[PDB]
Design a protein around this nucleic acid. Structure first.
Lengths: 163, 163, 163
RNA sequence: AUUUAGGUGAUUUGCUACCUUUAAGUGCAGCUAGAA
RNA sequence: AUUUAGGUGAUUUGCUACCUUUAAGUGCAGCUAGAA
RNA sequence: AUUUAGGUGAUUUGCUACCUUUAAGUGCAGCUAGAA
């Protein structure tokens, strides 16, 4: 619970073949790799990682009640917005295709300090994040969320990676 | 719980014959009929409605611990005092002799807006109001309350109205 | 629980024969006898009383997590420090050798006013004090606390007092 | 309309919390700055 | 009188919370304003 | 990257709380100062 991961580009491409909403893993504008938080949900043998995303203007219109997102901010400093967990684009993973961020070897950077500020807030809210993940998947499967990842198709296809 | 009612004048007079502390229900001074809130208590098959009453000076001396009263005020605006529920003068009712207020059809008036501000506070505290009503009846029957309605005689006599 | 006691000087000196850290009980400079609070711990048939002690400079360096002490202050007035319960020098007692303070009949003095402020703060924290007492004894017996009373020796020896 | 129930603190002014003789003194404020 | 137990955070300055080597990082403040 | 799920209030503007059609309206703010 509450660990940062990166995901192999080839696994991302494999999943993208079946669902184009799977998060982008390559972009020349990315300063660091796409970080995921996990494991946000473990259900029916599937382990899910959810992508982190930096602030965007439309994040202002996100209601806390939406399980598609978990808004992040510094513990006790709500004005210090730290992006959000984009649960609506979480994906099931093969453990061979994911790797923990090597925080204790990464050099001291503004990004690493932000990662730790995010981590404290996530750890304190782990149960809320898992509840939102479970609810979001459940509603999306029933067609009661719009434009999330295709959890049925991803759960049907992901284990055929490399096979 | 937390609904506004009016009570037939004949039922009120019937009960008043057995207990003169039964609330006055009609008066030319009334801008609106005497409103009751209910059902505040259901015990031994008897359903109780409690009268609302507008501010009086002596209400300032009412302590929260007294189950004879439930002071009302606007949610989050304690200085906007809205009278009280006079639990000590609650009465058991016959369903045929009471009527819901027709809120969804009543014309919009300042009185109706006040009713809604009262209703919100009552809804939020419905459990407390019910606890106070039960406690008040229990203490009054043991003779440990001051000048309440005579719940024993009222429960003995009320069902024989019209029979 | 949460009662003030004095302990007979002979019992104190008897225990001091086996453990020199047992609190000094009389000193010509003392305005009042050394007051104890109890019963803070009841374990394996032993009843424990803990000495109260007035402020010392080093009390500023005491951390709340230490079960060796329970700092006292006026309820809701943290700046009004009232010394501490020195649990690390608590002792098992023989009931015949302890006496309640005569709070009912003692004349009103500033010391008695302070005693009552201490009593309120202790009463509100009774469970916390008992937890600290049990933990401190447990850790001291394992050598995980420093310079407390010798609870093993005191519990072995206290009952042969007077025989 | 019907004009404040009694209690819970070795102590308790106001409000509050709590209890309903089948069971309960918490929190805030005020005052207090005592001594081991 | 007797003059600070050690820990719990992939990170943690103060205090607090939590745990008692079988375990456990909460909250406030401080600093931080990073980027997918 | 991927640009707000729908509901819960005899009433409900924003946010929040709550519920996941098996169920659910709390809190803050705004407005209101009504009368038995």
């Amino acid at each position: 619970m509450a660990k940062f991961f990166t995901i192999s580009s080839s696994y991302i491409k494999y999943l993208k073949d079946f669902d184009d909403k799977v998060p982008n893993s390559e972009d020349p504008t990315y300063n660091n790799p796409k970080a995921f938080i996990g494991i946000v949900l473990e259900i029916e043998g599937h382990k899910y990682l959810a992508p982190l995303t930096s602030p965007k203007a439309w994040h202002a219109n996100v209601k806390e009640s939406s399980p598609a997102f978990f808004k992040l901010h510094e513990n006790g400093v709500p004005d210090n917005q730290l992006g959000l967990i984009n649960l609506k684009f979480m994906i099931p993973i093969i453990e061979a295709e994911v790797s923990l961020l090597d925080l204790d070897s990464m050099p001291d950077t503004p990004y690493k300090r932000m990662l730790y500020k995010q981590l404290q807030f996530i750890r304190v809210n782990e149960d809320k994040i898992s509840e939102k993940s479970k609810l979001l998947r459940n509603l999306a499967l029933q067609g009661r969320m719009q434009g999330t990842c295709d959890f049925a198709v991803l759960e049907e296809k992901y284990q055929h990676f490399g096979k």
